[PDB]
């Protein structure tokens, strides 16, 4: 009732079948983002030998009508591999492949932002920007309520669940442990995890990652989480407000730095970037939402350790400010700063592109520059 | 619900199966029954591991129990045709696909591999290749699709095609196990994907040369059935498993020859399609085990399907009867896809009809007796 | 009843955990929260395996979520103090016990290890050793002891102490797993036994020198909680887990020094006890996390306990406040046991109080401020 | 799915309710709380059966517990306004609807009957009539519509509207009990029917004059809540209880005066419609219980719902804001229908707004403080 | 969960109870336990229906089994004091409340009616009136409030007070049955209402004169217990049934005399309040069955409760120890409220203390021995 029917099949049988030696053929799983801008799709292929780099993989295609990314006769779409990882659900030599999507006429799809993001990162390469993001999520049963919660009721009040240990403090640690190990095996740049303010709510961190690798790593981590939860029979949701009422919301803070900031006395560069950021609050708010600003309003309300969407604010060691400069970097006059505005279901390509445009290209206005800068 | 057998303790079975086997070898004989759609099997012991299919001995079975014979002369003969590694018992055990003959050594009514191989031997120098996409639906023991709400329906279509997640894909364990088992056995499996409604999947076979296509597809079907039996669910190839607005199942066939695969083979592809355009009724009859009934189940003109009453072709047209992939159009060489055959088709008959229509230039509404 | 998490097919988790993991290393930071009894943890990734606790980096956490801070200056600091092998993830992963400091680098209110180590450093030449017996009861998620009849009671006391059998011992799996995990991690675990009421157990730690006792006990408690979480039950250190005639839970402490261990140390033991006899109220206050409210619930004469307001000593008297084992008395050397501390005590405070009273000749109603 | 209270043995309750009660009489008071949508009740004993609402005494309740007052002066008084027979306890016990007042005798924030009554009295000579159609949905305690498959959906729309059969109508027992209870109580129920989705129903409150419309509708809502409590389910008036392609909820209100009812009243109906055409925003604000912030979820230009920002009217048109029944149009006399109000509206405010705009010729964006 | 007895078939019992009785009648005796807050009962057959309580004979019971006697002289006698009709077995059967006496005819320790009656008789000239409000909570047999989620909590406070609906009021059947049974029996049941948390309720025992107040309250408690026994649940008068941010339980007592009820009685009300303001500790001790140890958990400044040691009074103040209703203040007539007593108080003790302090103005720390 709380978990899916698939999860009640005998898994020893599956393990027995998966123990069989594979042979010479190699399995590859293609992954891409769909038309909703936040869903993922996948399908499997057979190769004659193990590819040594992403350049050796061939292109593929899929039917766009059933994905809501095309209509009419010209429904075929193209898949172009972008990044490759080791497959933790199968094992070596099988692979996972993240792909970009293009229309029949070879133009990028509406939900394909990696193209422009890669362009901008190539433009600003020399400054070595690094990114780190903290993804929050809630584990849910198949009945629409959070996993492990009382049937038609609520747990005790908040306070004992943040970083808690015990059968009555943390729900669903098996998924978390499995996800951690799977990401490490695949090669995702996972940096840590912790339990959140309300039980069945968790978080994992990614990075620091340079340039375009941040988005690839985050998306692959999301796919791995979904697949693991599917194995266990529960649902993982990135919704900014999973449960109504007093209970905690969900967000995705972003950490950003450059070589100048990481060098000695980089605090001046950090402050300059903060000042530049202060002028583009509405633009960045619009960027951070996949739907144009609907979810940002739902998240940013001033509660559950989140700032208020009304106005931009910054400070040192201020958890409630829009921008946070940690005390350690403040004391050492170097390091990084954290942006706490982006919502849990954000798009890393958009977030990173907006940050680069605002801070390093000195862009201004309400629209991005078309060709260059 | 799942079967009662699936609720027995499988650790016990694993304990027994882990015992060293010894010197004897098990072989499982497989054949097609009188309905033209079902499969049957039984096991025997051999003194040593065979090295090729020619070393296996002939066998027999009682035809009255499979509705393939009547009267006193009910004995039927099994003749091995192709051999594979057994994924349910591991080396050195084998799976054997056999042809069926009557007591007087004539082919059985449902034995089409005889004529299919006869025809294939005629055009060997042209190296025809085939590839087929088998769709199926996973069903519970109660007659409803696996994982669906009890006496209800899941959400509308759109999020299930190639989906990932507990609420978007049902029964991936069966799919993964089937993939691995086919790879171990040596079936030429090429890929898989989830389909438009949940609990519906597809796997692809090929490219396969000549007669090997039918053998490979039939063995893949048998392996799927055995795996589902292990898990306690039912796999159905019915063209319309669930009534109403939901998606139907089919089996697309891809076909090419050496000339088509050579540079500027698009001309040959076009001539083959032109020839195909004049035998629509014949091919429709060939694609159905019953003889022209199951075709109307899927060719209703909905959810990317062509109307059964008319023939059509195109490059990117998913809804056309014949499809030439866009990449094949851009590069003047490759293959083309036929979308008419139903999910419960017979590969021997399908491939024989394609060869007859395209390479032998046959005409009329009946096959040529001996010369073609 | 057991938790919902405990029904999630642990075979899947084992499959995932059997992966090689490559070159990165996981570290779990552990610390004590604002209630003075709870524990909290979170994980971090390191580039290589640390060889000693000195090369681990500092960290921080949000104090507002653990009631240890308020206002804007809610950031707190974590400073590693002791390192152990991780039994839940195996080598090369680690567990790290940390001290807590405020934003201004002052120790937190619940951070007693600072002063405890300060005091212990003044007596190092005397080599004090400690050993503590932790009791606990296993409880279901519904608030009743694990394995007890639903809304009922088991038979009366007598057959459960050190018992064996399905009807005499409840939950030995947790005990065995905890024992093995502590041995693997390197905790100085000395033994275990079942207690007077079913589902009630005890484990012993030591002998431990100086400050290591407190961290060993705390890490043992954390490991117990994690194991119970795996099995889906709750472990409680509450001094009176169930109302009525059933026995409470204590944390008897054993103490000795080099002089007592040496020949004819019984005289030193007697002087230490005579000194302890004059600070009953001070030690009672020290032994309780909340200032002395929980201890009154246990010391009532029953369950082999002494009166709360009366100090007494003896050799074989288990009902006295201080106990000198008979073998120690006969051999004129060894140790003595203090039976006052409650099950939810803080070892840092307990050991600090013992040291200050016995070896520093401290007197008065409050501890010495600066030194000694 | 159903509440724990509904699983108790109802035969025990019935045997208790069969006792003859004697000379005393029970009276249940009902009032509207601070949210403006919820209802509260409690009971007091009376010495003899009252024969007129004027005979019932005043009472009071704690306003701080219903979010209607704060501080020391939290007492609130309620004044009975209407009386009905009690269908749950039978004669001579009674139901009483009351108005709320602050510690100083001023109406509470959610007391709209006070002004509605004055507005009705200053127009009584024209004898306005009202008729309202309340839609609602039955929900289980788990949060899903009653009788729906767990985590799934029933078939598409089309068979449920005014349906009959186990697979087409869910929970008709509640509807029957409510209808009979209303008839016994004296509330004006005019009819009922099953709506476009299963577990969704509708009941009309017959033609009432002036202020009695709101009283009857509020008492009907209370009786529905009480009956659903007996059965173990929840009745919700949410305009959009289930997102997706599933029908929503509203409460249409029909209006008529003596002039319209008389011969050639169609011209007066047209005049009223023309007057209403210029107060769209004001009426939209008045019809939503919380200042025009919830009805937008339903009015979206689909499912025969007109655009929220666009006003339209027509004859026999169910897609317009205002509809003139075809029979009324043909007879040149009758009434007209307003389709804008949602399911959770306040009838007092709705009727007051209609009177103000159509009969008192008010034009401003705020109510006129003394008549018009 | 509910008791096993409540799952038996109640139709069988009803069939049996339908049998005509005959000439004999049953009488059920009731008396207060040795704990001072428990009730016991048993039944004897009588030849004829008694007309008045004076016709009932004396009886006895084993005091050693109720923990109010010891040794050989364990017999105890009970003397009937009040009689009512029996609602569980209809007319002519009866139930009788009795006083307890020792073997030597000295009143038992928990017999307070003996002295309460003397005080009331000595002060009868002024005709004191009393009214009390009993709060209680319905518990399942597993130890949690009835209808609460297993191991969880309902939503926060606010919707349950005087609530209606399946999700807002739990177990109204018990309340209805108890109300009707009390009315049939003949006790004053003045009214009822749902309380701040679900499964918590209140009933008020109407204006009684003299010891009749205590008699009626005790009989009402007995009736509640028997009805809850029929339904399978437990009723608890614990001051703090559920710890945390959840409402407690008290027993408010309203007092008045003829002078207070007469015109310009507010002066006497103020005089009585002033007299009470000096015996706060004495009244706190008297309002607790144990001697002033249980009400502490209730009075903490929360739930609108008064301070434990700071007496206060006011008009329309819920937070004060004594409150004067606003209507009483405005009319200069009526009564005043004492909000100190907890749920498990003894009405005889409460009324006796009020009489002693207010009417004959005692001042000592102990009750006066002779006629005071
Ligand atoms: N120099 C840097 N530049 C950018 N990001 C960094 C840098 N150093 C660390 N980070 C990132 O900061 C993140 C810290 O996240 P976390 O400690 O969970 O945030 P918080 O303390 O606000 O909860 C890590 O994911 C890490 O990748
Ligand atoms: N040269 C060829 N001749 C015949 N078949 C081919 C050739 N190349 C590929 N195929 C087959 O075409 C099939 C395409 O499968 P799939 O991608 O599932 O269908 P679609 O692209 O129509 O969705 C594969 O199974 C493959 O075996
Ligand atoms: N010389 C010593 N100094 C301090 N502690 C000691 C010494 N020798 C043994 N101990 C401790 O005494 C404890 C004995 O506990 P246990 O036998 O369970 O107590 P009991 O016999 O009272 O049940 C062990 O945990 C051990 O570490
Ligand atoms: N003369 C009238 N004045 C006011 N209301 C009327 C008059 N005649 C009928 N009605 C109301 O019209 C409503 C018709 O309800 P119903 O038939 O369910 O709606 P519909 O006609 O849209 O299907 C009834 O509630 C009834 O009270
Ligand atoms: N003249 C009076 N003398 C004594 N008691 C009275 C008098 N009038 C009313 N009461 C009592 O006051 C109580 C009022 O109870 P209730 O209204 O439930 O609580 P509250 O007054 O706090 O709202 C009743 O129990 C009733 O018996
Ligand atoms: Mg973080
Ligand atoms: Mg952060
Ligand atoms: Mg395909
Ligand atoms: Mg295809
Ligand atoms: Mg011991
Ligand atoms: Mg001991
Ligand atoms: Mg209608
Ligand atoms: Mg209508
Ligand atoms: Mg009251
Ligand atoms: Mg009161």
């Amino acid at each position: 009732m709380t978990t899916s029917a698939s999860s009640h099949l005998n898994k020893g049988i599956k393990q027995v079948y998966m123990s069989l030696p594979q042979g010479e053929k190699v399995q590859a799983m293609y992954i891409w983002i769909d038309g909703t801008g936040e869903g993922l799709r996948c399908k499997t292929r057979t190769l004659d030998s193990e590819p040594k780099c992403v350049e050796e993989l061939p292109e593929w295609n899929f039917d766009g009508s059933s994905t809501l990314q095309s209509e009419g006769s010209n429904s075929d779409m193209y898949l172009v591999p972008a990044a490759m990882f080791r497959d933790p659900f199968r094992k070596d030599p099988n692979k996972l492949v993240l792909c970009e999507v293009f229309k029949y006429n070879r133009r990028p799809a509406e939900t394909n932002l990696r193209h422009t993001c890669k362009r901008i990162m190539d433009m600003v390469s020399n400054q070595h920007p690094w990114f780190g993001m903290e993804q929050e999520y809630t584990l849910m049963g198949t009945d629409g309520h959070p996993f492990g919660w009382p049937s038609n009721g609520f747990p005790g009040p908040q306070g004992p669940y943040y970083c808690g240990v015990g059968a009555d403090r943390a729900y669903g640690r098996d998924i978390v442990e499995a996800h951690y190990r799977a990401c490490l095996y695949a090669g995702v740049k996972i940096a840590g995890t912790n339990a959140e303010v309300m039980p069945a709510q968790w978080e994992f961190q990614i990075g620091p990652c340079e340039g375009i690798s941040m988005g690839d790593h985050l998306w692959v981590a999301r796919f791995i989480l979904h697949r693991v939860c599917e194995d266990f029979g529960v649902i993982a949701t990135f919704d900014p407000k999973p449960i109504p009422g007093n209970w905690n919301g969900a967000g995705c803070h972003t950490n950003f730095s450059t070589k100048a900031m990481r060098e000695e006395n980089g605090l001046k560069y950090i402050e300059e970037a903060i000042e530049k950021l202060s002028k583009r609050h509405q633009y960045h708010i619009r960027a951070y939402d996949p739907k144009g600003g609907l979810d940002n309003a739902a998240r940013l309300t001033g509660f559950h350790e989140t700032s208020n969407i009304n106005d931009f604010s910054a400070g040192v060691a201020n958890r409630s400010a829009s921008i946070r400069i940690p005390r350690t970097v403040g004391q050492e006059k170097k390091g990084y700063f954290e942006d706490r505005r982006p919502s849990a279901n954000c798009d890393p390509f958009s977030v990173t592109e907006a940050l680069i445009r605002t801070c390093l290209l000195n862009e201004t206005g309400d629209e991005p520059f078309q060709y260059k800068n």
Side-chain angles (χ1 to χ4, degrees), chain A residues 242-297:
Chain A
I243 286 303
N246 191 51
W247 331 78
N248 239 44
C252 193
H253 313 322
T254 304
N255 305 265
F256 172 54
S257 74
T258 72
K259 159 137 72 44
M261 310 193 188
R262 294 191 290 282
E263 265 156 2
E264 265 316 352
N265 307 88
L267 198 67
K268 77 192 293 329
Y269 299 113
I270 296 169
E271 273 140 342
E272 274 176 62
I274 300 265
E275 169 277 320
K276 292 180 191 180
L277 266 173
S278 67
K279 323 278 199 33
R280 299 251 274 174
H281 179 81
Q282 222 60 27
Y283 180 78
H284 270 225
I285 290 280
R286 186 177 339 125
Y288 293 166
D289 182 341
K291 288 167 285 197
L294 196 142
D295 288 335
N296 278 336

Side-chain angles (χ1 to χ4, degrees), chain A residues 149 155-162 196-199 201 241 243-249 303-305:
Chain A
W149 278 30
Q158 288 181 355
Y161 306 110
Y162 176 80
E196 272 300 326
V197 176
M198 208 62 181
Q201 189 170 329
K241 197 71 199 203
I243 286 303
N246 191 51
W247 331 78
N248 239 44
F303 300 102
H304 40 94
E305 286 240 327

Side-chain angles (χ1 to χ4, degrees), chain A residues 81-362:
Chain A
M84 185 165 84
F85 298 89
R86 298 207 295 155
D87 188 329
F89 313 106
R90 298 137 190 171
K91 293 202 279 283
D92 281 333
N94 308 293
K95 308 285 183 192
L96 305 175
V97 191
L98 182 70
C99 305
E100 288 192 34
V101 185
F102 296 78
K103 296 184 185 183
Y104 82 92
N105 59 8
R106 289 286 176 168
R107 312 257 56 51
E110 298 337 322
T111 55
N112 181 357
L113 317 173
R114 191 180 183 279
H115 207 253
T116 317
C117 195
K118 175 73 179 300
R119 277 257 308 308
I120 271 49
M121 304 282 162
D122 280 349
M123 275 177 30
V124 187
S125 175
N126 42 292
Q127 307 201 45
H128 294 293
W130 290 358
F131 296 94
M133 313 188 64
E134 309 168 38
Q135 184 67 69
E136 257 154 36
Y137 59 100
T138 301
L139 296 171
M140 308 276 293
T142 47
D143 57 2
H145 309 304
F147 176 72
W149 278 30
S151 215
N152 319 318
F154 304 86
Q158 288 181 355
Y161 306 110
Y162 176 80
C163 294
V165 60
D168 52 330
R169 317 258 298 289
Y171 304 170
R173 176 170 258 124
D174 287 332
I175 285 76
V176 184
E177 295 293 312
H179 180 254
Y180 207 141
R181 185 63 65 97
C183 281
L184 279 176
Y185 181 87
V188 174
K189 186 74 167 292
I190 185 160
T193 72
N194 75 276
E196 272 300 326
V197 176
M198 208 62 181
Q201 189 170 329
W202 299 81
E203 175 186 300
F204 69 83
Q205 300 94 37
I206 304 286
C209 300
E210 182 168 324
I212 201 70
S213 70
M214 178 70 245
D216 304 334
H217 280 243
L218 181 51
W219 276 117
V220 173
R222 287 175 175 177
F223 174 82
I224 288 169
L225 177 62
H226 281 304
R227 183 73 177 66
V228 166
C229 286
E230 185 190 308
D231 262 353
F232 279 102
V234 304
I235 297 158
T237 194
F238 305 125
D239 186 288
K241 197 71 199 203
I243 286 303
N246 191 51
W247 331 78
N248 239 44
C252 193
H253 313 322
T254 304
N255 305 265
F256 172 54
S257 74
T258 72
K259 159 137 72 44
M261 310 193 188
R262 294 191 290 282
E263 265 156 2
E264 265 316 352
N265 307 88
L267 198 67
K268 77 192 293 329
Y269 299 113
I270 296 169
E271 273 140 342
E272 274 176 62
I274 300 265
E275 169 277 320
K276 292 180 191 180
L277 266 173
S278 67
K279 323 278 199 33
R280 299 251 274 174
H281 179 81
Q282 222 60 27
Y283 180 78
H284 270 225
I285 290 280
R286 186 177 339 125
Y288 293 166
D289 182 341
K291 288 167 285 197
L294 196 142
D295 288 335
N296 278 336
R299 170 175 156 60
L300 305 162
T301 62
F303 300 102
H304 40 94
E305 286 240 327
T306 310
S307 87
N308 194 305
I309 201 167
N310 201 62
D311 196 10
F312 179 93
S313 63
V316 174
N318 202 332
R319 298 254 167 199
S320 66
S322 86
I323 312 297
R324 182 164 160 290
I325 298 169
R327 203 182 289 278
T328 309
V329 306
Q331 300 180 339
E332 299 192 343
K333 316 302 163 203
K334 74 177 185 274
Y336 60 92
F337 70 94
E338 180 191 50
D339 186 352
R340 302 167 69 78
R341 291 175 290 174
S343 289
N345 63 337
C346 72
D347 198 336
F349 293 136
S350 317
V351 171
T352 54
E353 195 196 339
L355 280 166
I356 291 287
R357 281 180 180 268
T358 292
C359 296
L360 274 46
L361 298 177
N362 312 303

Side-chain angles (χ1 to χ4, degrees), chain A residues 1 21 41 80 167 237 310:
Chain A
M1 67 306 278
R41 313 267 178 153
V80 182
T237 194
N310 201 62

